[PDB]
């Protein structure tokens, strides 16, 4: 990554490398993996971002879909930012330079520490997160329409499943509740908070 | 977080990220989780606070209730602190800026390191802890009225359950004691310390 | 804590937070927990000391007894050190300020880094350790009078139990020994060291 | 490694040493091991690279093949860069000096921190990765021709196996699909993205 | 401990605290525990040394014997170095000051960082190691006279037991060997190295 | 160890101490332990090297053989470098000073940080590694002559055993192969690389 000592390059740590590998192994593409990726890739160069992605052993269907999203975003960058070099001067980054495939670590450091900075690490992380959100959505197992409260299921456990599913996918909470809780929630009226609904069906 | 090197931004560590995720997995919303959250979020930016909250996989009913509390506190901030920009100058933070949803990391750093400082991280942590305390209270399984000493239960074990329940929820200690210990505690008289009561029923 | 970089504030580490939580989980209030608490709270502010105490999930009977001891010591501080402010000047700490309940982190830093320093962290740790020693003594399961050597118990194992019990509670070593070892220890005479007694009954 | 404090030598950490040993033990020569090697050897001297390779206990067939690749690349370096010393001056590195077998740590530091730098660590890592890719390819168990979707296998699981195999080895995705999914994928037409194909056979 | 930043005090780390506690739990008073103690207490103040000793939960017979040795060495220090204060000046350390029982942390820092330094940490560690060696010797289970090679025991395994026992306790190697190996070792003659003896009976 | 802050002494870390102890416990004297020792002892003083060796609990036959090698190398040093002191000046190191038995830590620091430096840590590590290689060779269980490919053993698994044994001990690869693979390898002709031989018998 690039961090303050002045902004300088540091090697990606074994702790960071191990943390990302283990979260993907344990959680796959559950929605909470994306905030973890963003946090573990704080200050990351494009090289560091590729390192994190390439160290993942499984899920190569997802990793191939991520490449497609990256190539789509890279092509859109080139359309908006065409490139035209002067000896010892900074070249303009194309899409593949931002993605780390045609740029060196020194060029990436040169862009990220410039004044004003050309934040190639943050631009590329945005493309990666965009691709990761699409993977989270596709690998979401259930529709919100099929999350309904069981006859003896606690309302809290049902609401956990409801908003877990909604997070992966992205009135109905009351409609999908069981007969006993639904009748209570209808009686509360409009403008009921989640807290009040959960207290009522407790 | 923001820490002294002069006050500068540092990346949230894998250790901090992992610690928060594991305590929530192991303890859910037991009352002791809130002091752990506050300690792990020492010097945290609003971005860091969102990172910690968003990395939690389960408990999405609770996380949705937390958003409602955050929105309520954000709306109250806007009522008390209305916003009105001058090129290259610091804008006034609204509720959603304090919550990290409409503010950038650089703006958050700008507020937190200003002289005098506008501590958006500490203001937002206060809102989060307020919301977390409400969740702790709702998820408390038992009323203090139902914590009574068993016939053969040690007084120490009963007092542990009593103040555990009282912590989650928030004369009666003697009333809820068993016949044998109650008679001893009545004989001690007024002004008895917990130490003296526990020694007496040992 | 407060440490040398000049004396500056540092965030309590996840390692320290985790270490204290796990020792209490594994050892409860065995006497060796108190030296571990003191070491883990090296340079601790009153806020840090409260953090460590409040992160403990179980043992709320003990934690309530600790509050009583803290309030007793705080009341004794106020009797000896009554408080009387001048703009931008340091106020005098009362008992509740030393205990971290009515003081801010900045005030605690202000006292601890003053010249001369008002060491509120060390004063409060003294009160906490005083309260923790009382808890260790009450939770000690056995009297030293009931620690006697078994017919086939090795003398070393008996001496381990003897001084383990004595540590928790706080001639008799010979009296509580078994017939065979007692006869040997009587024959050694006065002024026998523990080493010599243990070698004799080996 | 060599890192910024000015560029200075640091000892390879126990964490780095342990991380490399464990990944090889757990993953053998799965393709994702090579990006992990490159990341863990960030800033590595030739001595550090040899340390990492020599600490591997098993897989001595692979380690011997790696030596052959290293010797081939070293011989090609000597053909392109023949060596010709002046007291207290920097000598030109031959292939075996880049590989760390005939050079000292001080000479390696001298080359890597020169202005302009002769990056012997990065040149040698390139040779090692070249040799490691050949080992990954040989130890790949299955041809892409033999990765075909099962009658009841989910398309996602089949695509995972397909691109896992393709990564180790390096129209057909549709041909190797099962009758039901193949018919759907043919109906999509040309220019179908992986996302669209995976959604169609879901 | 006291370390270079100029020599300054640092808090004993949770890693050091945990390491010492676990080695004592796992190894008891096997001889290799003493070099581990010395290494973990590198730069330690008398307070740090007491912390390490006091954090040990079991083995209170041994810890009491250690106190006796410490008191003996402290009494011998007072005989050789009698003490006689001038405002704001450094007092002379007595035995109990070196042992950390009657000295403060600031006085210990004052002695250890003086020019010339009065190394109270190293003097006390010497006394502790002296006491720990006596405990290792007493808790050694077997005499070297009873370490004899079995009929089918490999010579290497026998030599391991022989020098393990000799280390705990502190021609005979040949005498205690089995008939077959003894005859071979007699035939080698005088001046045989351990390597040669072990190769011969392999 | 001695490291750059200027070259200064640092305490050996608990991580380094633990790493060396565990590798010896897990791997004994497999050849890969020697590169791990060298890496973990980077910048080590003679005191640090003794610490690492003395913290090993088992294998006292091997540790005694290591002392013999150390004494042999120390005696050879004294023959080549005889010693002859001037107040406040650096004395010449004898063999036992390099081995850390008759030298203090300050003298070791004095030699290692001199200009020009007398690298007593690196000289002693060389002697230790020499002794460790002899132990690896003696504890090697099998001769390379007895490593032959099984009737149904994969060639890769056989080559792994072959070069594993060769590493511990230090045309035949083809001779020791099974009838089917041997016939294939003979047909390849002279100048066949290991890669080509392994591909042929796959
Ligand atoms: N082979 C394995 N099987 C099961 N669990 C494992 C394995 N390897 C590692 N783990 C898990 C269990 C342990 O709790 C944890 C070990 O990491 P740990 O030593 O606690 O980190 P650490 O505290 O040394 O890191 P730091 O360097 O930050 O102190 O990882």
| Rounded-to-integer distance, Cα B80 and Cα C190, Å | 81
Ligand 1: distance of its center to the CA of E21 in Å? 18
Check E10 against C16: CB less than 8 A apart: no
- CA E121 → CA A50, E113, E168, distances in Å? 50, 11, 26
Q: Do E160 and F68 touch (CB under 8 A)?
A: no
Round to whole Å and give the CA distance between A68 and B136.
Answer: 44
Mark yes or no for CB contact A39/B55 under 8 Å: yes
Residue F29, SS3 per DSSP: coil
Runs of H (alpha helix) within F12-54: 14-27, 33-40, 46-54
Judge whether A8 and A16 are in contact, CB under 8 Å.
no
| Cα Rg of chain C, angstroms | 23
Distance from CA of D36 to the nearest CA of A (A): 6
Question: Is residue D139 less than 8 Å (CB to CB) from chain F?
Answer: yes
Which residue, judged by its Cα, is nearest atom 25 of ligand 1? Answer: A15
**How close is the Cα of C36 to the center of ligand 1, in Å?**
22
Say how many Å lie between the CA of residue B36 and the centre of ligand 1: 21
> Is residue A7 within a helix (H) or strand (E), and if so which, with residue range?
strand A7-9
Instruction: Judge contact between A130 and B28, C-beta under 8 A.
Output: no
Task: Compute how many other C-beta atoms are within 10 angstroms of the C-beta atom of residue D32.
Answer: 21
SS (H, E, C) A29-59: CCCCHHHHHHHHCCCCCHHHHHHHHHCCCCC
Q: Is B89 an 8 Å CB contact of chain A? A: no
> How far does the CA of residue D49 sit from the closest CA of chain A (Å)?
15
Residue D86 bridge partners (DSSP): none
Q: Does D have 3 or more CB contacts under 8 Å with F? A: yes
Residues of F in contact with D61 (CB under 8 A): 156, 159-160, 162-163, 194, 198
The secondary element (H helix, E strand) that includes residue E155 is helix E155-169
Residue A51's region, left for phi above 0, alpha for psi from -120 to 50, else beta, is alpha
Contact flag F164-D12 (C-beta cutoff 8 Å):
no
Burial code (b: 16+ CB inside 10 Å, e: under 16) for C74-84 equals: beebeeeeeee
Residues making up chain A, counted from first to last: 202
Indicate yes or no: CB of A40 within 8 angstroms of CB of B8. no
Query: For residue E32, how far is the Cα from the chain centroid?
Result: 8
DSSP-assigned letter for residue F101: S
- Hey, CA dihedral for D119, D124, D126, D129, is it positive or negative? negative
Cβ within 8 Å of residue B194, ≥6 positions away:
B159, C61, C64, C65, C68
Span E1-143 CATH architecture: Orthogonal Bundle (1.10)
* Cβ-based contacts of E36 with chain F (< 8 Å): 17, 55
Let me know how long chain D is. 202
Establish if C198 touches chain E: CB-CB under 8 angstroms: yes
The Å distance, Cα D15 to ligand 1 centre, comes to 11
Please tell me if residue B172 touches chain C, with a CB cutoff of 8 Å.
no
Domain D144-202: CATH superfamily is Retrovirus capsid C-terminal domain (1.10.1200.30)
Q: To 10 degrees, the CA torsion angle through E183, E189, E193, E194?
A: 10
What span, in angstroms and rounded, lies between the C-alpha atoms of A149 and A183? 13
Helices B33-40 + C14-27 axis angle, to 10: 150
DSSP secondary structure letter of residue F3: E
Chains that touch A (3 or more CB pairs under 8 A): B, D
Of A141, A37, A178, A30, give the one whose Cα is nearest residue B58.
A30
Residue A60 and residue D1: Cβ atoms within 8 Å? no
Q: How many CB pairs under 8 A join D and F?
A: 72
Q: Two tokens at F169?
A: 């001990």
Q: Please judge whether F39 and D55 are an interchain contact, meaning their C-beta atoms are less than 8 angstroms apart.
A: yes
Structure tokens at E28: 């008891």
C43 touches chain E (CB under 8 A): yes
CA of B165 to the centre of ligand 1 (A): 34
CA distance D73 to D96: 10
Q: Which residues of E touch F18 (CB under 8 A)?
A: 19
Our CA-based measurement puts residue A197 at a distance from the nearest CA of chain B, in whole angstroms, of 11
Give the per-residue SS3 of chain B: CEEECCEEECCCCHHHHHHHHHHHHHHCCCCCHHHHHHHHCCCCCHHHHHHHHHCCCCCHHHHHHHHHHHHHHHHHHHHHCCCCCCCCCCCCCCHHHHCCCCCCHHHHHHHHCCCCCCCHHHHHHHHHHHHHHHHHHHHCCCCHHHCCCCCCCCHHHHHHHHHHHHHHHCCHHHHCCCHHHHHHHHHHCCCCCHHHHHHHCC
From chain E, the residues in CB contact with F54 under 8 A are 32, 35
Residue of chain B whose Cα is closest to the Cα of A194: B65
Burial F37-73 (b: 16+ CB within 10 A, else e): bbbbbbbbbbbbbbbbbbbbbebbbbbbbbbebbbeb
Q: Rounded to the nearest 5 degrees, what angle is found at the Cα of B73, between the Cα atoms of B69 and B79?
A: 145
Contact check, Cβ <8 Å, B8/A4: yes
10 Å CB burial of residue B152 (0-12, 13-18, 19+) is: exposed
Resolution (A): 2.0
> Using CA atoms, how far apart are residues D56 and B159, in angstroms rounded to an integer?
56
Closest atom of ligand 1 to CA, residue D15: 27
* Residue E151 CB-half CA count within 13 A: 0
Parse chain B into domains and list their residue ranges.
1-143, 144-202
CB contact under 8 A, B39 and C60: no
CB–CB of E32 and F61 under 8 A? no
Q: Yes or no: say if C169 and C100 are a contact pair by the CB < 8 Å rule.
A: no
Q: Are D195 and A138 in contact (CB under 8 A)?
A: yes
Residue C150 contacts B, CB cutoff 8 Å: no
Round to whole Å and give the CA distance between C58 and B160. Answer: 7
What is the rounded distance in angstroms from the CA atom of residue A73 to the CA atom of residue D31?
26
Of F59, C176, D34, the closest CA to residue E194 belongs to F59
Which residues in chain A touch residue D30, judged by CB atoms under 8 angstroms apart?
57
The pair of three-digit structure tokens given for residue D193, joined into one six-digit string: 């993205």
DSSP-H helix ranges across E28-142: 33-40, 46-54, 60-80, 95-98, 105-112, 120-139
Chains within contact range of chain C (3+ C-beta pairs < 8 Å): B, E
Q: Cα(D25) to centroid of ligand 1, in Å?
A: 15
Closest chain B residue by Cα to residue A168: B57
Closest CA to A178 of A149, A199, A146: A149
CA gap A54, A128 in Å, rounded: 13
Which SS3 state, helix, strand or coil, does residue F65 take? helix
After which residues does chain A show a gap where C to N exceeds 2.5 Å?
Answer: 5, 84, 170
A1 Cβ neighbours under 8 A, 6+ residues apart: A9, A10, A12, A41, A42, A43, A44, A45, A48, B11
CA of A22 to the centre of ligand 1 (A): 12
Instruction: Please state whether at least 3 CB pairs lie below 8 Å between chains C and B.
Output: yes
CA distances to A187, E121, F121 from F2, rounded to whole Å, are: 75, 21, 9
Residues in chain E with CB shorter than 8 Å from the CB of C16 are 14
> Do B135 and B62 meet the contact criterion of CB atoms below 8 Å apart?
yes
SS (H, E, C) chain C: CEEECCEEECCCCHHHHHHHHHHHHHHCCCCCHHHHHHHHCCCCCHHHHHHHHHCCCCCHHHHHHHHHHHHHHHHHHHHHCCCCCCCCCCCCCCHHHHCCCCCCHHHHHHHHCCCCCCCHHHHHHHHHHHHHHHHHHHHCCCCHHHCCCCCCCCHHHHHHHHHHHHHHHCCHHHHCCCHHHHHHHHHHCCCCCHHHHHHHCC
Q: How many helices (H) and strands (E) does chain A have?
A: 11, 2
Q: Do F54 and E32 touch (CB under 8 A)?
A: yes
Which among A33, A22, A26 has a CA at the least distance from the CA of A135? A33
């Amino acid at each position: 990554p690039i961090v303050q000592n002045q902004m300088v390059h540091q090697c990606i740590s074994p702790r960071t490398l191990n943390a990302w590998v283990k979260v993907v192994e344990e959680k796959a593409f559950s929605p909470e993996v994306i905030p973890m990726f963003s946090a573990l890739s704080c200050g990351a160069t494009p090289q560091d971002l590729n390192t994190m992605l390439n160290t993942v052993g499984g899920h190569q269907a997802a990793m191939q879909m991520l490449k497609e999203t990256i190539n789509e975003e890279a092509a859109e960058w080139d359309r908006l930012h065409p490139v035209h070099i002067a000896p010892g001067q900074m070249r303009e980054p194309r899409g593949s330079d931002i993605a780390g495939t045609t740029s060196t670590l020194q060029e990436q450091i040169g862009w990220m520490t410039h004044n004003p900075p050309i934040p190639v690490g943050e631009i590329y992380k945005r493309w990666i997160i965009l691709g990761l959100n699409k993977i989270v959505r596709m690998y979401s197992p259930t529709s919100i329409l099929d999350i309904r409260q069981g006859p003896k299921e606690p309302f809290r456990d049902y609401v956990d499943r409801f908003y877990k599913t909604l997070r992966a996918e992205q009135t109905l909470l009351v409609q999908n509740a069981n007969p006993d809780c639904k009748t209570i929630l209808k009686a509360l009226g409009p403008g009921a908070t989640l807290e009040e609904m959960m207290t009522a069906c407790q």
